[PDB]
Amino acid sequence: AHFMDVHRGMHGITSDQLHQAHQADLAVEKDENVHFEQAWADPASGTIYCLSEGPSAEAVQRVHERAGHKADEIHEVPLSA
Amino acid sequence: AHFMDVHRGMHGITSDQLHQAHQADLAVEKDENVHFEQAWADPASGTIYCLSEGPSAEAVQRVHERAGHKADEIHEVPLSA
């Protein structure tokens, strides 16, 4: 399944910090059969969007939690255009 | 510049409805040099995420308005991983 998750409150985040966070997810994602495909961040509002594939939102969130940053919101996105 | 925008209240949206909404944006995006890259929808939560390239959030929103669906939230996402 496909998921979009959102992290809020991240104002001022740098490219280095976003890379670091994404690498932390990648380091433990395979245990849960999750793959984080893309991350996009707005340092002004402090909003990070993460697109993943995995068996469930629960699995995606367990990966994030191990990586140090559980998402504030997660939605399955079964439709795409 | 790169933008992520969010539409809420789209409970129960179908694949056909998402496809047509995306087609409507694509039909008028050129005028504003806006380029919608991908859309993802969650019919359960009623959330649509739209990733685009355009000159500004103002331009992206003018396109959405013409296509009949101004986004509830729009963020420049200058960082990606």
Author numbering:
A (entry chain A), B (entry chain B): 2 to 82
What does the literature reporting this entry say, word for word?
The overall structure of SCO4226 adopts a ferredoxin-like fold with an α+β structure: five β-strands (β1-5) packing against two α-helices (α1-2). The N-terminal four β-strands β1-4 of one subunit form an antiparallel β-sheet, whereas the C-terminal β5 swaps to the corresponding β-sheet (β1′-4′) of the symmetric subunit, completing an extended antiparallel β-sheet of five strands. Each asymmetric unit contains a dimer of SCO4226, with a buried interface area of about 1100 Å2 on each subunit.
The two subunits of the dimer are almost identical, with an RMSD of 0.14 Å for apo-SCO4226, and 0.29 Å for Ni-SCO4226. Superposition of subunit A of the apo-SCO4226 structure against the ferredoxin-like fold domain of these structures revealed that the overall structures could be superimposed, except for the extension of β5 at the C-terminus of SCO4226. The hydrophobic core is formed by residues Met5, Trp41, Tyr50, Leu52, and Val78 from both subunits.
